[PDB]
Amino acid sequence: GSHMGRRFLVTVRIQRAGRPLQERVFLVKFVRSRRPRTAS
């Protein structure tokens, strides 16, 4: 299908409000592998 394209954001938005401590863990994994992205 097409849709708007914001279904993935809805899931993450709910997690951000879930538990307080958690974003710190994501930063660790994100920082551990920091790399930009380019279109193809």
Curated annotation (Swiss-Prot):
Ubiquitinated in normal cells by TRIP12 via the ubiquitin fusion degradation (UFD) pathway, a process that mediates ubiquitination at the N-terminus, regardless of the absence of lysine residues. Ubiquitination leads to its proteasomal degradation. In cancer cells, however, TRIP12 is located in a different cell compartment, preventing ubiquitination and degradation. It comes from the Eukaryota. This is Tumor suppressor ARF. Its main location: nucleus. It comes from Mus musculus (Mouse). The chain holds residues 1 to 37 of 169 of the full protein. It is found in: Nucleus, Nucleolus; Nucleus, Nucleoplasm. Disruption phenotype: Mice lacking isoform tumor suppressor ARF of Cdkn2a display delayed mammary gland involution. Induction: By progesterone. Induced by activated Ras, and this requires DMTF1. Repressed by non-classical inhibitors of NF-kappa-B signaling such as doxorubicin, daunorubicin and UVC, and by the NF-kappa-B p65 subunit (RELA). GO terms for cellular component: cytoplasm; granular component; mitochondrion; nucleolus; nucleoplasm; protein-containing complex. Does not interact with cyclins, CDK1, CDK2, CDK4, CDK5 or CDK6. Interacts with COMMD1. Binds to BCL6, E2F1, HUWE1, MDM2, MYC, NPM1/B23, TOP1/TOPOI and UBE2I/UBC9. Interacts with TBRG1. Interacts with CDKN2AIP and E4F1. Interacts with CDK5RAP3 and MDM2; form a ternary complex involved in regulation of p53/TP53. Interacts with NOP53; the interaction is direct and promotes ARF nucleoplasmic relocalization and ubiquitin-mediated proteasomal degradation. GO terms for molecular function: cyclin-dependent protein serine/threonine kinase inhibitor activity; DNA binding; DNA-binding transcription activator activity, RNA polymerase II-specific; DNA-binding transcription factor binding; MDM2/MDM4 family protein binding; ubiquitin-protein transferase inhibitor activity. Capable of inducing cell cycle arrest in G1 and G2 phases. Acts as a tumor suppressor. Binds to MDM2 and blocks its nucleocytoplasmic shuttling by sequestering it in the nucleolus. This inhibits the oncogenic action of MDM2 by blocking MDM2-induced degradation of p53 and enhancing p53-dependent transactivation and apoptosis. Also induces G2 arrest and apoptosis in a p53-independent manner by preventing the activation of cyclin B1/CDC2 complexes. Binds to BCL6 and down-regulates BCL6-induced transcriptional repression. One of its GO terms (biological process) is positive regulation of DNA damage response, signal transduction by p53 class mediator. Transmembrane segments: none annotated. Keywords: Apoptosis, Cell cycle, DNA-binding, Mitochondrion, Nucleus, rRNA processing, Transcription, Transcription regulation, Tumor suppressor, Ubl conjugation, Ubl conjugation pathway. The gene is Cdkn2a.
